[PDB]
Write a protein that binds this ligand. Structure first.
Ligand SMILES: [Zn+2]
Lengths: 94, 59
RNA sequence: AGGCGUCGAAGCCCGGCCUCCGGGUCGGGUGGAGCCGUCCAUGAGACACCGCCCACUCCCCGCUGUGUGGCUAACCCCCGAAAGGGGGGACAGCGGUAGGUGGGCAGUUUGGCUGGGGCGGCACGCCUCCGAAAAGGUAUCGGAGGCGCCCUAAGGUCGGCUCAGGCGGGUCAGGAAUCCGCCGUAGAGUGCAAGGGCAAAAGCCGGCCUGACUGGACCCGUAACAGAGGCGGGUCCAGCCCCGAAAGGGUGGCCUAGCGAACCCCUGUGCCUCCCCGGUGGGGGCCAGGGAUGACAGAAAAGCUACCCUGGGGAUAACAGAGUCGUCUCGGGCGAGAGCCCAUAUCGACCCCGAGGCUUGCUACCUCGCUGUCGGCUCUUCCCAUCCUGGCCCUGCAGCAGGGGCCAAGGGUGGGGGUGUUCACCCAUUAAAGGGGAACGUGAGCUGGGUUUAGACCGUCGUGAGACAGGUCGGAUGCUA
RNA sequence: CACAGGUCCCAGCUAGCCCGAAAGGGUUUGUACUGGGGCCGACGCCUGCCCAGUGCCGGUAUGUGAAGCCCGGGUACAACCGGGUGAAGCACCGGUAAACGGCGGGGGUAACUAUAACCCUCUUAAGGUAGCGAAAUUCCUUGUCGGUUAAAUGCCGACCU
RNA sequence: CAGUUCGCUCCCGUGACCCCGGGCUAGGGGUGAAAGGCCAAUCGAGGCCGGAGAUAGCUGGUUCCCGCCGAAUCAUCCCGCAGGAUGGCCUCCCCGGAGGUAGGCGGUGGGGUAGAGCACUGAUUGGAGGUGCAGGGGGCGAAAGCCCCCGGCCUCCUGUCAAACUCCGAACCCACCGCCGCCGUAGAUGGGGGGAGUAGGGUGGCGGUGUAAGCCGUCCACCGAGAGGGGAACAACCCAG
RNA sequence: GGUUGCACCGUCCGUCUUGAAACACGGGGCAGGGAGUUCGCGGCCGUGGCGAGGUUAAGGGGGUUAAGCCCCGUAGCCGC
RNA sequence: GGGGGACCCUGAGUACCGUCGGUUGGAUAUCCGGCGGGAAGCUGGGAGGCAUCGGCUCCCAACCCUAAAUACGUCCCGAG
């Protein structure tokens, strides 16, 4: 599926329709400073079996699209609706 | 499972311990102090058969 | 844009060395006043000078570790009662930490439905049609199919046009290229299954756009009646916008499929917060989007047991009984056809109507706190759909014999070879050497050859434990009525 | 089952293999004609091909590779983020089958119309060689032929589908 | 006689032979010429006390009497299918005050089953008529083409169909209204609270499947949980509560 | 009241089960023993006290043969 | 028994940091132990629930002893 690079939409910050650039959210690894990771590392130490599930080969055939729209006047990025899943996503200029 | 013969032999049970009382004794040289710098004469008194040695022994 | 020059140069003569031996530098002397560029060319200009450097490379010193070779004084191994000697040596060993390998040793898992279980399949999550019985609802391993996507256009809106198929005509041109008329209720298309809906449109062709948006309310369905997390859908208010002259329409695809909790994590965005107070780094919290569990209301997960054990189940299989008779045994109706002519002496195609419960199968009704298997021996009894014996009828019955049928169950229906065999095959006799029921009669009568435990061998399969309605040797039969 | 006999593997002794939490210890009053670990099983004739898979052994220039160490960033210090070095092990390479195992399949061909293939061509690592064969292994099966009986799902000899 | 003995028969009987006294090896361990054999009548992990009154959705049992009312095996979810939870169905108490609806009559609407039919979709026997329609057989060819059988398509006549067809279409069922009937101020309809049991149903008619028995749903009539009088006895059948 | 005669009727008891006289399980006789108990927390109801308030715990004092009896005890808890 | 000082003393492999195992409600913020490292010491040091800087508050470890209120009953008096 082809998607525009820019679209003019209502901006919750400007309170009016403005041009927004489309961006894809890029995944990042778990931060070692988060409380969940701290607890996981703390419990992993010592003797005993693995204390958490280890899912193997579990992943949907195609994932939803996490998009963010950045206003060209404010610079702030906002989300827009609920993502839809497609395995092809080409950004087309315009 | 259960143990192996080699595993059981390491505990030194009488089933595996050698009977080191039927034998004539270990054959070691005299202390090096006698033999070094000096030469000693000796006489062979008897030749006999050692139960576990694979070779004859002499006094 | 000039720089050096007795604050000493060209131009010749030797020598070391780096080296694309291009050709740049360097210690020594004859040497006694000049040499480059500003010029141009070059994508970029000066071996005119001044800067920190760019890449390869050499070396003085300080530090740092890696490897090699050596030493003894730690440490270890040997003789010896010890003193003392010999061998090894910063290795080894020991203590801490980090990665790998690791059924040697442990704790576990190895799902469910299922006309018994296993293999198979998914009826294990959804959508359309029939089942379904003209409100609603309605199950089966019921019947016929689809889904786990795709589309910045196949989305929103405004204007204009009408499709498939056919008839007649026309250069190449033919069944089929592009064209001109007539008919044409959709027989076309609408992204994809099916159903439903769509003709001045929801279809085909174009113009503009991004309502496939933000903050919220209520309601229906999954899940009737009648409870629900999650999810899908419908009716609206406000904000900012799109098309249009206007009304009016837009919260994705004309409606019904195309998907998913807790905890944790990533991203956006503004706020609240962290132990006496304040600043800083970082963390915690609220709102929104995202990463998945198809066993799809969401465990992280392989097998053998014939050495097996426990609690149960006739809610459930094997033997036996019960129901049924597809199958099996037996019988009947019509009469094409074969029989030298003659359907019926004999046979009886195709088709149709039945009996028995003597083969097998199906069901799962009784029996799993035990109803002890096949075959054989012993013994008793019964049925007739009669093999012989008694009496008859038709004949393609000369006699002797044969073929078919009827009445008749008093009597008989034996002996042997291989095989556990029932059975079937064979041998010599015989009047004949009939088939069946009795818990597939009969183990508180017998035998134990086979089946069916625990031992073992071979073939095949499995990485292995091991398995085989595949062979083979051995393998217990309780009793005072 | 054991057995004598055959062959294979580890070890020069502070060894190899093994028991333990450690200390210590079994083999050891032992020393390769020895100690320990597998398999086959007197004796006679023999033991063919295969190292791709799995296992083990040797090498390892190179890639990956944990901590530690080093460099840059961040933190008035840390936590934290990115790189460099990085042993074993994997990847890669070589030996090894009296190590676990494997040793098929097609296209065909010579005095008929007879079957079979001395012999060629593909197919994986290579296609089962001497022997034996309805076997304690053979489903069809009571295979077929001959001997044993009057009669043979038996036993014996033969064929090899 | 014996929680493995007795008789006959049989095998070894100078060797890896048989037997006594003293010692050592102890439970994931010993020992094993290897049978999972033996380790005090116990061995695929001994015995004894302790954890311990282990746990099970599985089996069994659960003690006096009379009164009143009185069920259910079916929807959704569960590693769920011999078990649970939310509902449906039963019982007891309370509030709140004026209506409610199992049956009937008429009316306003909805439906697509039985039956029927070919007007859509898809089938189906033969006859007639019209069409070169890119069939196919042939006659008929220098090429341009026609002369017949046969295949297809269209119309009519003729003889037959449909669970996944409908131009039509009942009986009947459902929602709402008005009235009759019945219930309700001795308090219904409705609302809140406490306690359950029920998650195997069977027979009987109807529908899908199956040769049938049977399997799976549907109807709520009877047994389950029901006496008495009958069908000879009988769960279901008749009268009857 | 004991026993027995006649007429008619009557296939034991407990249990799982759709279905029990059952060829389904538990049932020689008699006597004794024998199986919804205690605490903590939560939801309800029957009754009683006080009431915008209610109530004490640990503990203290008086009296007593005694652990009974009498008085205080506002920490705390709930409600506002 | 009180006022001044300008001099002296006031606990080391300890406090503490990194890492590993255990334990804890202790959560980046409990306590114990192993391994490597390791101070100031009165012109001093520690704590205030992530770390650090500044303020403020409290305190002086790495040495020792300590009755009563408390637990139990092989025993005794007393009671149900
Ligand atoms: Zn903006």
């Amino acid at each position: 599926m082809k998607y525009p690079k820019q679209i003019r939409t209502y901006c919750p910050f400007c309170k009016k329709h403005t041009i927004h650039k489309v961006e894809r959210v890029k995944k990042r690894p778990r931060s070692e400073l988060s409380a969940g990771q701290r607890r996981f590392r703390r419990i992993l130490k010592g003797y005993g079996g693995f204390p958490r599930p280890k899912p193997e080969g579990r992943e949907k055939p195609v994932k939803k699209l996490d998009l963010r729209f950045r206003c060209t006047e404010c610079g702030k990025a906002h989300t827009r609706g609920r993502g839809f899943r497609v395995k092809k996503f080409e950004l087309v200029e315009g | 499972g259960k143990s192996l013969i080699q595993q059981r032999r390491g505990k030194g049970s009488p089933t595996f311990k050698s009977p080191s009382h039927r034998f004539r004794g270990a054959v070691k040289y005299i202390p090096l102090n006698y033999t070094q710098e000096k030469t000693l004469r000796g006489v062979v008194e008897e030749i006999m058969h050692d139960p576990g040695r694979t070779a004859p022994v002499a006094r």
